[PDB]
Design a protein around this ligand. Structure first.
Ligand SMILES: *[C@@H]1O[C@H](CO)[C@@H](O[C@@H]2O[C@H](CO)[C@@H](O[C@@H]3O[C@H](CO[C@H]4O[C@H](CO[C@H]5O[C@H](CO)[C@@H](O)[C@H](O)[C@@H]5O)[C@@H](O)[C@H](O[C@H]5O[C@H](CO)[C@@H](O)[C@H](O)[C@@H]5O[C@H]5O[C@H](CO)[C@@H](O)[C@H](O)[C@@H]5O)[C@@H]4O)[C@@H](O)[C@H](O[C@H]4O[C@H](CO)[C@@H](O)[C@H](O)[C@@H]4O[C@H]4O[C@H](CO)[C@@H](O)[C@H](O)[C@@H]4O)[C@@H]3O)[C@H](O)[C@H]2NC(C)=O)[C@H](O)[C@H]1NC(C)=O
Ligand code: ZIS
Ligand code: YFX
Ligand code: YFX
Ligand code: CA
Ligand code: CA
Ligand code: CL
Ligand code: NA
Ligand code: NA
Length: 804
């Protein structure tokens, strides 16, 4: 190699140098390529970090870590408390907050800088619970914009979350799917320790610093060597902000390994945790006093953001694959707060994932982890579409670990850990935004960390790279946006078929006992088929179809559907169930009733014979017969165009939802509007499948089998108003249930539906936005709400955790 040359006047230089030369940037330590004099010139420590009364007006001495001399301000290198100790100034924390209506920047600043202050393991409840010891953070929080918590991404580990913050992408798309990974195409392994993580090939997407660079905005570094202490990181950022206009970056990052580092040792609320929270707050204080000195404290936007929280976890709460598997040695486990399993050797053709899962399913009474094939994980986790994510996964219960065998845990160190399902309260983390671009004293609802990349791009005037945020859904955070989104254009307009077919044209092998026979009640049934009740059942406009297809709008007394001539079933079925609505049962004579739809050709219909011949597959209905508004209207629910294929095991789930839960939600929420439909995602990419991607059909037919069924359940946020007459904001909960031929996922399934079904639905809670990706549909096109507010609503997730 080559080291010689000097960091003289180059400490923490922003552009990298090429060999021959030794490096003086904050990455050099990691390449053992710093110049011989790096520590000496760049990592000065003499006299510590604060001005004292006597150092005031001192003679500049270049060996000091920071300066209290008369020239320090313009040299850009005073200690952060200089003006307080020597010029009678006040600490930023002691000043009242004053609204920052416009940026107040020094001449030459083209745009307010962004500083991202990122804290590791900063659990959401530390904001309330540590508030006495964190006065600077608490001023940021209460004078700026803050959420009660921010939802990390799964796994709730450091690398997936930091890189998701930086890219707006799910780990499956960015590639950093855990703190440890194996990539079979590379044949390589990635870890926290080691040089492997420095290779380019792991890091997908386009993180904020690159977005910035490519578009002409300069960035400080987003990597700090572990041995550079926090005080020096702050001084380096402050120095960079004193650079000349042509050289000065616009976006900066600070990172603290605390409080995570302590949390692992002592638990989230260990008595030892007070100090690290004091010490982070003191750092924030140094940055803010430093900004105030440079007259930048009403100019810079500051983001205080965590990557994940921290949970109580101990060695005795470890489940061992050795208590379940006899073939334990033929597998590799990525262990801990999640499990990922693959074959130890791919020259082993006796390795069977099928039997591995079976041996891990529902085996002990209080079993603290649950196996899944990755494509069967809740769709809200978005954790399947990457060759680095193993087919077998274990979702581990909060407070537990999974290990391969006892030797692995002993050959108790720790009291805290994180990595669990990102809905878990103890995994939630923080967000505060403070500055001219953020709002003043404003609380916003919790949101997902995938949304921030768009906002940081807005804050810096950048166009974001394509990402998983929904741009506009966080506009309510900002005093001025620059992003006004517009509704996507409908691609396919519907047909509106009338009565075009006689009953005898159909040979579907279907039967119904419906031959049971007046211009009042026959002009009425005509009007219902023309959409006379459509304002009742279709409350927010019809969904828009965002891809090219052929489909028909079908109207009925009790429901409206968008029926796909390609997939031979509805894409969406819309209906409203008022608080007053009544549950009836299906009359005996109509148990097996399926009726041809005279609006839709035999050639674009399902048939009953296929369901008869298919021994695995049965069928269900999207608008539930149980909720029909009259005995005559019920006939509408048995139309072949309301049928969808369903495994008998799944009919147990679906029947309970339709018979029991919809009515329950209607009475609790004062009416609900329900939109239900099928989802096809056979390649588990989270995106609607094209017809040529379907792997399963009802036997001997072209009726495709859904991988999932969704419902979107909307009511009035002010529940004193009924769902069909709501004048203000809406409230939504949704789900994406896996369409599975067994109920192995639910260990209590041999019991009554009242003991397990709702728990399954809760697990498979979803955002309307997840359902849009999966169906190519766009919901809520006609409301009186602003589009920004609708976007927020579409990104909402009902989590079913208790309060924070
Ligand atoms: C969350 O958001 C993201 C981002 O919007 C969504 O992900 C996007 O989804 C798109 C649809 O699936 C997908 O489009 C693909 O793109 C293929 C080419 O992609 C490569 O280039 C991308 C662009 O690079 C630019 O920007 C980067 C910096 O970001 C620079 O490096 C470049 O210089 C460019 O300027 C690049 O982003 C992408 O990265 C992935 O792959 C890398 C390794 O190669 C990874 O390191 C990285 O992390 C990305 O990995 C993810 O994505 C891949 C799939 O791309 C996935 O397998 C991984 O698991 C991981 O999840 C690539 O380098 C393009 O080839 C595709 O074209 C096929 O389909 C089209 C449809 O229009 C057909 O017209 C065409 O026929 C073609 O088919 C051909 O190929 C077929 C399959 O190989 C074959 O069967 C067929 O017969 C044909 O030969 C398609 O357009 C985006 O790439 C993807 N972007 C990202 C960043 O992931 C995601 O969907 C969102 N999630 C949800 C739930 O909504
Ligand atoms: O700028 C970066 O390096 C610094 C850095 C990296 C990470 C971090 O922090 C990580 C964390 F946030 F987690 F802390 C903090 C940091 F300074 N990166 C982005 C540019 C590349 C190197 C890595 C990725 N490259 C590639 O060629 C990719 C290959 C495969 C791929 N797929 N899609 N596109 C691609 C392109 C060059
Ligand atoms: O300087 C850095 O990060 C800047 C940055 C990078 C990217 C951003 O993206 C987020 C943004 F875009 F929003 F800014 C935001 C940012 F601060 N790094 C310091 C070095 C490590 C990566 C982060 C390697 N490492 C670890 O292995 C820790 C894991 C867990 C832990 N617990 N105790 N000890 C530890 C050690 C920490
Ligand atoms: O130097 C860079 O990438 C190396 C690196 C540096 C640090 C990592 O990870 C740090 C962590 F893992 F600890 F988080 C991971 C890494 F690929 N690049 C950044 C600038 C460009 C060259 C490549 C991309 N454009 C020019
Ligand atoms: Ca972390
Ligand atoms: Ca798909
Ligand atoms: Cl991991
Ligand atoms: Na059958
Ligand atoms: Na079961």
């Amino acid at each position: 190699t080559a080291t010689s040359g000097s960091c003289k006047g180059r400490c923490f230089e922003l552009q990298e140098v090429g060999p021959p030369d030794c490096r003086c940037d904050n990455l050099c330590k990691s390449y053992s390529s710093c110049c011989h004099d790096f520590d000496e010139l760049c990592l000065k420590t003499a006299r510590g970090w604060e001005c004292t009364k006597d150092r005031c007006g001192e003679v500049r001495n270049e060996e000091n870590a920071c300066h209290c001399s008369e020239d320090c301000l313009s040299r850009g290198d005073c200690c952060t408390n200089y003006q307080v100790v020597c010029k009678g100034e006040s600490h930023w924390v002691d000043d009242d907050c004053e609204e920052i209506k416009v940026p107040e920047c020094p001449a030459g600043f083209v745009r307010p800088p962004l500083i991202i202050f990122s804290v590791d393991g900063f659990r959401a409840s530390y904001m309330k619970k540590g508030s006495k010891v964190m006065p600077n953070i608490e001023k940021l929080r209460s004078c700026g914009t803050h959420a009660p918590y921010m939802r990390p991404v799964y796994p709730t580990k450091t690398f997936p979350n930091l890189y998701t913050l930086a890219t707006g992408l799910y780990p499956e798309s960015h590639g950093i799917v855990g703190n440890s990974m194996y990539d079979p195409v590379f044949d390589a392994s990635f870890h926290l320790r080691g040089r492997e993580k420095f290779n380019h090939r792991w890091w997908g997407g386009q993180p904020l610093w690159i977005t910035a660079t490519k578009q002409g905005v300069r960035a400080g570094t987003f990597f700090w060597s572990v041995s550079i202490p926090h005080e020096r990181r702050i001084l380096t950022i402050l120095q960079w902000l004193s650079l000349p206009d042509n050289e000065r970056p616009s976006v900066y990052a600070f990172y603290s390994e605390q409080p995570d580092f302590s949390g692992h040792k002592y638990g989230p609320f260990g008595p030892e945790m007070t100090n690290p929270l004091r010490e982070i707050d003191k750092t924030v204080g140094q940055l803010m006093d430093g900004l105030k000195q440079l007259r930048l404290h009403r100019c810079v936007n500051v983001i205080f953001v965590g990557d994940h929280g921290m949970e109580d976890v101990t060695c005795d709460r470890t489940e061992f694959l050795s208590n379940y598997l006899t073939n334990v040695d033929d597998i590799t486990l990525v262990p801990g707060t999640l499990g990922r399993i693959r074959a130890k050797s791919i020259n082993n053709s006796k390795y069977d994932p099928k039997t591995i899962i079976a041996a891990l399913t529902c085996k002990k009474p209080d079993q603290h982890f649950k196996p899944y094939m990755k494509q069967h994980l809740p769709k809200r986790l978005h954790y399947a579409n990457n060759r680095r994510i193993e087919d077998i996964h274990l979702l581990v219960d909060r407070r537990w670990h999974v290990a391969r065998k006892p030797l692995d845990v002993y050959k108790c160190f720790f009291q805290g850990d994180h990595g669990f399902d990102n809905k878990v309260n103890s995994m939630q983390t923080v967000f505060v935004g403070y500055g001219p671009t953020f709002k003043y004293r404003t609380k916003v609802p919790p949101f997902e960390n995938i949304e921030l990349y768009n906002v940081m791009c807005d804050l810096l005037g950048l166009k974001p790279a394509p990402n998983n945020g929904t741009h506009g859904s966080l506009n309510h955070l900002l005093r001025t946006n620059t992003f006004r989104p517009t509704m996507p254009d409908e691609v396919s307009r519907p047909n509106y078929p009338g009565i075009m077919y006689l009953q005898s044209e159909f040979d579907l092998g279907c039967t119904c006992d419906d031959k049971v026979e007046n211009k009042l009640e026959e002009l009425n049934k005509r009007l219902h088929t023309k959409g006379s009740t459509k304002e009742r059942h279709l409350l927010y406009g019809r969904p828009a179809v965002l891809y090219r297809t052929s489909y028909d709008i079908l109207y009925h007394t009790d429901f409206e559907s968008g029926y796909s001539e390609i997939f031979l079933m509805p894409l969406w079925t819309s209906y409203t169930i008022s608080k007053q609505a009544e549950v009836s049962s299906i009359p005996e004579h109509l148990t097996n009733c399926v009726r041809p739809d005279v609006r839709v050709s035999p050639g674009f219909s399902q048939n009953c014979l296929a369901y008869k011949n298919d021994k695995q597959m049965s069928y269900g209905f999207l608008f539930p017969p149980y909720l029909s508004s009259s005995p005559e209207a019920k006939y509408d629910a048995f139309l072949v165009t309301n049928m969808v294929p369903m495994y008998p095991a799944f009919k147990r789930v679906w029947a309970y939802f339709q018979r029991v839960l919809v009515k329950k939600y209607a009475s609790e929420r004062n009416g609900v509007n329900v939109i239900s439909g099928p989802i096809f995602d056979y390649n588990y990419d989270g995106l609607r499948d094209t017809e040529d991607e379907i792997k399963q059909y009802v036997e001997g037919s072209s009726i495709p089998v859904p991988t999932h069924y969704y419902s979107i359940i909307t009511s009035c946020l002010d529940f004193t108003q009924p769902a069909d007459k709501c004048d203000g904001p809406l409230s939504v909960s949704s789900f994406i249930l896996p369409h599975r031929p067994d109920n192995d996922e639910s260990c209590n399934s041999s019991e009554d539906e009242s003991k397990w079904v709702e728990e399954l639905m809760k697990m498979h809670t979803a955002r309307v936005r997840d359902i849009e990706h999966l169906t190519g549909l766009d919901f809520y096109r006609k409301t009186s709400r602003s589009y920004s507010e609708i976007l927020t609503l579409k990104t909402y997730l009902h989590t079913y955790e208790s309060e924070i």
